[PDB]
């Protein structure tokens, strides 16, 4: 991936998360669980919806276009008509296939960027109150109940509220 998140420092995907694309996985004293981040996932849905919509909108409706007949003394004009039809078909085929290739790549890159940015958000929230174990997880240096977990999810984590505890546990 371009941004090193998907198939990068985060090695695999979670089949257990079934309500979104990018999400979390918390495990505290009250238990564990998966939960999809709705803001980032919704932004991706809006952007990709607008992308596919733009692709369809730039393909205007093809109206009536039928073949033509030519008598035995109009072979040049028949071959010119065929050349026109075949040429336009070739160009539109090339356009469609190439567009789908390139924008497929850019879509996967877009998801990779969304995951990288989400990870950087959570990291920028936690700061040194947790250590960065591999695979894109954070090991907390303090207690974090469901209140604190949901505080991290919606981007409202309180750093000074645990600086004493984390500085003590870091020994």
């Amino acid at each position: 991936g371009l941004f090193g998140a998907i198939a990068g420092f985060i090695e695999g995907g979670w089949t257990g998360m079934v309500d979104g694309w990018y999400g979390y996985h918390h495990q505290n004293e009250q238990g564990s669980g998966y939960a999809a981040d709705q803001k980032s996932t919704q932004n991706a849905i809006n952007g990709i919806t607008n992308k596919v919509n733009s692709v369809i909108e730039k393909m205007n409706t093809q109206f009536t276009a039928v073949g033509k007949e030519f008598n035995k003394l109009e072979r040049r004009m028949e071959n010119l008509n065929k050349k026109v039809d075949d040429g336009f078909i070739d160009i539109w085929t090339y356009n469609a296939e190439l567009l789908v290739l390139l924008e497929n790549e850019r879509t996967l890159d877009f998801h990779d960027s969304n995951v990288k940015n989400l990870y950087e958000k959570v990291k920028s929230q936690l700061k040194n109150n947790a250590k960065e174990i591999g695979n894109g997880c954070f090991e907390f240096y303090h207690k974090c109940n469901d209140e604190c977990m949901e505080s991290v999810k919606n981007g409202t984590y309180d750093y000074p509220k645990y600086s004493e505890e984390s500085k003590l546990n870091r020994e």
Partner: protein
């Protein structure tokens, strides 16, 4: 206590192609390529088409006796002709500018059929009962229902000179023919003259036909020919026919009403009580996708034809599960 950031996975076998990697298994995708059709000729926005059956465009527009079923149709969304029709010009000859007439009729949404020169009010000094075994119907000799083969009456073929003014406020399609007998005996025997002429003139159309007598190969048990001719008459113009023989006079004419979206297609698909917004020779398309690989010939509001076999666009992620 730990929190992790990760991404979705599933059992999806959807694959797409990318610029760096082919056959990438993804979690969610949307196909943009329509490949399905119903294999039937359907109505276009409720309006039914015109099936010609075993009749060609020439046979349909000239009034071939085996095409009487097509006379009652005066409005359609498009025209279906079998790939190679059976009943066309039953009396052999050359149809002048046949393809141009096809192209003209491709933009016609409806017309009014009316006998421009009624068969029993126009030629009191001529015979209007000429028939041929090459244009037979129910085993007996017959002739086109939109033309009138003027032959000899009481042993004379007087100088005829008729005309028609466009009292219809639309374009009027006029068709006629010119007979070319095989030998001189049938020529004099049919038109009582040795050097005849046909003359058709309008405000901007003007042509004069001379019969060419020669020995020609048999086509449908006939050595003589009939060259077919047609013209469009603008609203308000007057067309003048002057002839002393060898004129296949016009009987019925057509007042044309133009319309976009119609056309002539070759198809063997059967008609059915279906309605669609998109029709192809392979069948009707019911889709909102931007591309289709069904057929390049389209009628109505169709997707854009491409030669591709697969156009799948990824919406989800690279599926990396377990």
């Amino acid at each position: 206590d730990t929190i992790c950031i990760g991404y979705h996975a599933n059992n999806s076998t959807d694959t797409v192609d990318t610029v760096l990697e082919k056959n990438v298994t993804v979690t969610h995708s949307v196909n943009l390529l329509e490949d399905s059709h119903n294999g039937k000729l359907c109505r276009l926005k409720g309006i039914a088409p015109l099936q010609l059956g075993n009749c060609s465009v020439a046979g349909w527009i000239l009034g071939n006796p085996e095409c009487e079923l097509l006379i009652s149709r005066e409005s359609w969304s498009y025209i279906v002709e079998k790939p190679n029709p059976e009943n066309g010009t039953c009396y052999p000859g050359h149809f002048a500018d046949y393809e141009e007439l096809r192209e003209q009729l491709s933009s016609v949404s409806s017309f009014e059929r009316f006998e421009i020169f009624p068969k029993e009010s126009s030629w009191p000094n001529h015979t209007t009962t000429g028939v041929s075994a090459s244009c037979s119907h129910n085993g007996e000799s017959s002739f086109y229902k939109n033309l009138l083969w003027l032959t000899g009456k009481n042993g004379l073929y007087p100088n005829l000179s008729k005309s028609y003014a466009n009292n219809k406020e639309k374009e009027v399609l006029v068709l006629w023919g010119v007979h070319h007998p095989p030998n001189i005996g049938d020529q004099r025997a049919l038109y009582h003259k040795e050097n005849a002429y046909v003359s058709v003139v309008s405000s901007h159309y003007s042509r004069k036909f001379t019969p060419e007598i020669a020995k020609r190969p048999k086509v449908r048990d006939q050595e003589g020919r009939i060259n077919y001719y047609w013209t469009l008459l603008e609203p308000g113009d007057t067309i003048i026919f002057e002839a002393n023989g060898n004129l296949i006079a016009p009987r019925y004419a057509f007042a044309l009403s133009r319309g976009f979206g119609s056309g002539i297609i070759n198809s063997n698909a059967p008609m059915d009580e279906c309605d669609a917004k998109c029709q192809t020779p392979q069948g009707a398309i019911n889709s909102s996708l931007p591309f289709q690989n069904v057929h390049p010939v389209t009628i109505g509001e169709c997707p854009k034809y491409v030669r591709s076999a697969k156009l799948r666009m990824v919406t989800g992620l690279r599926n990396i599960p377990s």
